[PDB]
Design an enzyme around this catalytic site. Structure first.
Site, PDB file in Angstrom:
ATOM      1  N   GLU A  35       0.795  -1.209   0.000  1.00 53.81           N
ATOM      2  CA  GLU A  35       0.000   0.000   0.000  1.00 53.81           C
ATOM      3  C   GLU A  35       0.836   1.271   0.000  1.00 53.81           C
ATOM      4  O   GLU A  35       0.637   2.153  -0.838  1.00 53.81           O
ATOM      5  CB  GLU A  35      -0.980   0.036   1.183  1.00 53.81           C
ATOM      6  CG  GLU A  35      -2.177  -0.935   1.110  1.00 53.81           C
ATOM      7  CD  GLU A  35      -3.141  -0.688  -0.049  1.00 53.81           C
ATOM      8  OE1 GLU A  35      -3.134   0.401  -0.651  1.00 53.81           O
ATOM      9  OE2 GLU A  35      -3.923  -1.602  -0.356  1.00 53.81           O
ATOM     10  N   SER A  51     -11.718  10.841  -4.120  1.00 51.73           N
ATOM     11  CA  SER A  51     -11.373  10.413  -2.774  1.00 51.73           C
ATOM     12  C   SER A  51      -9.853  10.308  -2.723  1.00 51.73           C
ATOM     13  O   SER A  51      -9.203  10.248  -3.772  1.00 51.73           O
ATOM     14  CB  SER A  51     -12.023   9.061  -2.461  1.00 51.73           C
ATOM     15  OG  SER A  51     -11.452   8.004  -3.224  1.00 51.73           O
ATOM     16  N   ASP A  53      -6.460   8.334  -0.598  1.00 52.24           N
ATOM     17  CA  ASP A  53      -5.976   7.255   0.261  1.00 52.24           C
ATOM     18  C   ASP A  53      -4.871   7.843   1.116  1.00 52.24           C
ATOM     19  O   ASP A  53      -3.955   8.481   0.590  1.00 52.24           O
ATOM     20  CB  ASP A  53      -5.449   6.108  -0.582  1.00 52.24           C
ATOM     21  CG  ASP A  53      -6.531   5.472  -1.418  1.00 52.24           C
ATOM     22  OD1 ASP A  53      -7.661   5.348  -0.910  1.00 52.24           O
ATOM     23  OD2 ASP A  53      -6.264   5.110  -2.578  1.00 52.24           O
ATOM     24  N   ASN A  60      -9.019   5.029   2.801  1.00 51.47           N
ATOM     25  CA  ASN A  60      -9.829   5.930   1.987  1.00 51.47           C
ATOM     26  C   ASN A  60     -10.765   6.940   2.700  1.00 51.47           C
ATOM     27  O   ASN A  60     -11.516   6.595   3.627  1.00 51.47           O
ATOM     28  CB  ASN A  60     -10.604   5.090   0.973  1.00 51.47           C
ATOM     29  CG  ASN A  60     -11.198   5.915  -0.136  1.00 51.47           C
ATOM     30  OD1 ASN A  60     -12.336   6.358  -0.034  1.00 51.47           O
ATOM     31  ND2 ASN A  60     -10.442   6.109  -1.216  1.00 51.47           N
TER      32      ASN A  60
END
Length: 130
Positions: A35, A51, A53, A60
């Site tokens: 990630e 949106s 992250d 999110n």
């Protein structure tokens, strides 16, 4: 902050992530690795749905944290998204725990399915003493 592998492994274990809701520590490590590359300040804007992250676990803003600019968003972790950009990962861990409490569990992150599911994830915690 960019954590070194074993440093993060020990930190997560201390924060009670090992086996949380059935998820082994090695899975959490694999998730953080893909990630953010163990980077707490990582941010990723999704132009497709407006949106963003945030942080170590790339949580999110549409469902988990509030950044004020994401349309139709909720803030299930009851946190400002800024909290997920600190060097201290306490808040990020508490939110990650909240995310997996939903029916999907660890599967909520597509990166986990692609890079961690059904694989030998032992490498992420080997030699760390956890």
């Amino acid at each position: 902050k960019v954590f070194e592998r074993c440093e993060l492994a020990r930190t997560l274990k201390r924060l009670g992530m090992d086996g949380y809701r059935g998820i082994s520590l090695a899975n959490w490590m694999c998730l953080a690795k893909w990630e953010s590359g163990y980077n707490t300040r990582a941010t990723n804007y999704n132009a497709g749905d407006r949106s963003t992250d945030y942080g170590l676990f790339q949580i999110n803003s549409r469902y988990w944290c509030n950044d004020g600019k994401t349309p139709g968003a909720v803030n299930a972790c009851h946190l400002s998204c800024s909290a997920l950009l600190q060097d201290n990962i306490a808040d990020a861990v508490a939110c990650a725990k909240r995310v997996v409490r939903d029916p999907q569990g660890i599967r909520a992150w597509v990166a986990w399915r692609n890079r961690c599911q059904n694989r030998d994830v032992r490498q992420y915690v080997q030699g760390c003493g956890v």
